[PDB]
Ligand binder design. Structure first.
Ligand SMILES: O=C(NC[C@H]1CCCO1)NC1CCCC1
Ligand SMILES: O=C(NC[C@H]1CCCO1)NC1CCCC1
Length: 330
């Protein structure tokens, strides 16, 4: 089997991407944020505290003939932005892009933090990191990918995120028309439950490539690129007037600037992030200070190749017995 779904940016900055997901029978279509940095499929629901729902589409298990309570099971998750959610669990049929999993754990939110309530465009999360991070207790549950794996033509999924445009998530096959050149594969450590890999270095603009090992995670559910402070300082030093602002919470730059590209290594290959991808626009409406898309990972404890980086590539998440990541230009 295979599946193929279009993923659409939630707003003009590509802050996140939503993908329609069919849950239950008859189908209830919810727009979920596919998150390779977490392992819970959770949804706004008929159980979510009414004051915490503001325009999201909700899952109503009582309207699904295939829903079953996973008796006793609860979940609770906290994300690196300080957001959180928690609730109980149903099993139901879930389909993405024509690929169907029966008996998927669908984590029904009873509570969500303010950041979720305030984002009317995101109806929940579909985690695609390793199932060892799933938060369901007392019986940990599998991701949609882990449950689909054995049925797929190839044990893979691919992320092809757009810049200010829709893109694609594919399951079970590699669309050889979706990228240019060859795919360079790199080793993954699952020790922390993430798609964790080691970049071979970086370049700023037209500058020389610095060969240096940068451990980090491929995380579709993080907006920005978070890298060590040394790398980030080297990048922003090439932008007149850029500075780190403790009041704003990161690097800002003059909206009149033209940003340099940023290159990261994947083995001997190179992925180039155009400068325009690093523009996150005015810090507040009408401001001439703009927020940067490359930020320091210091204090976060991990480097994160978020959407700013991943949208510059065709990315293969290879879930074979020995997992690997692949990157191609596109
Ligand atoms: O929490 C992280 N990003 C934000 C969440 C918000 C909803 C989906 O993604 N990233 C974590 C990955 C490991 C360190 C931080
Ligand atoms: O990227 C992050 N969240 C993005 C999602 C949640 C709401 C908008 O889209 N959070 C990062 C902050 C520092 C590490 C994780």
């Amino acid at each position: 089997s295979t599946g193929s779904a279009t993923t659409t940016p939630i707003d003009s900055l590509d802050d996140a991407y939503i993908t329609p997901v069919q849950i239950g029978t008859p189908a209830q279509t919810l727009n979920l944020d596919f998150d390779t940095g977490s392992s819970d499929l959770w949804v706004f629901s008929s159980e979510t505290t009414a004051s915490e729902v503001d325009g999201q589409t909700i899952y109503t298990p009582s309207k699904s003939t295939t829903a079953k309570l996973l008796s006793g099971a609860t979940w609770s998750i906290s994300y690196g932005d300080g957001s959180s959610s928690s609730g109980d669990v149903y099993t139901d049929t879930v389909s993405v892009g024509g690929l169907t999993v029966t008996g998927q754990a669908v984590e029904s939110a009873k509570k969500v933090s303010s950041s979720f309530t305030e984002d009317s465009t995101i109806d929940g999360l579909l985690g695609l990191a390793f199932s060892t991070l799933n938060t369901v207790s007392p019986t940990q549950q599998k991701t949609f990918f882990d449950n689909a794996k054995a049925s797929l033509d190839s044990p893979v999924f691919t992320a092809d995120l757009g810049y200010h445009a829709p893109g694609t998530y594919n399951f079970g096959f590699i669309d050889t028309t979706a990228y240019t050149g060859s795919i360079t594969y790199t080793a993954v450590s699952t020790k922390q439950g993430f798609w964790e890999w080691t970049s071979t270095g970086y370049a700023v603009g037209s500058g020389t490539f610095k060969s240096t090992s940068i451990d980090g995670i491929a995380d579709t559910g993080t907006t920005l690129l978070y890298l060590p402070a040394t790398v980030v300082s080297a990048y922003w030093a090439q932008v007149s007037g850029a500075k780190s602002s403790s009041s704003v919470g990161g690097y800002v730059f003059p909206c009149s600037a033209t940003l340099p590209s940023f290159t990261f290594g994947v083995g001997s290959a190179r992925i180039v992030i155009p400068g325009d991808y690093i523009d996150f626009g005015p810090i507040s409406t009408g401001s001439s200070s703009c927020f940067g898309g490359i930020q320091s990972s210091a204090g976060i404890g991990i480097n994160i190749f978020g959407d700013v980086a991943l949208k510059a590539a065709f990315v293969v998440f290879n879930g074979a017995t020995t997992p690997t990541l692949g990157f191609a230009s596109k």
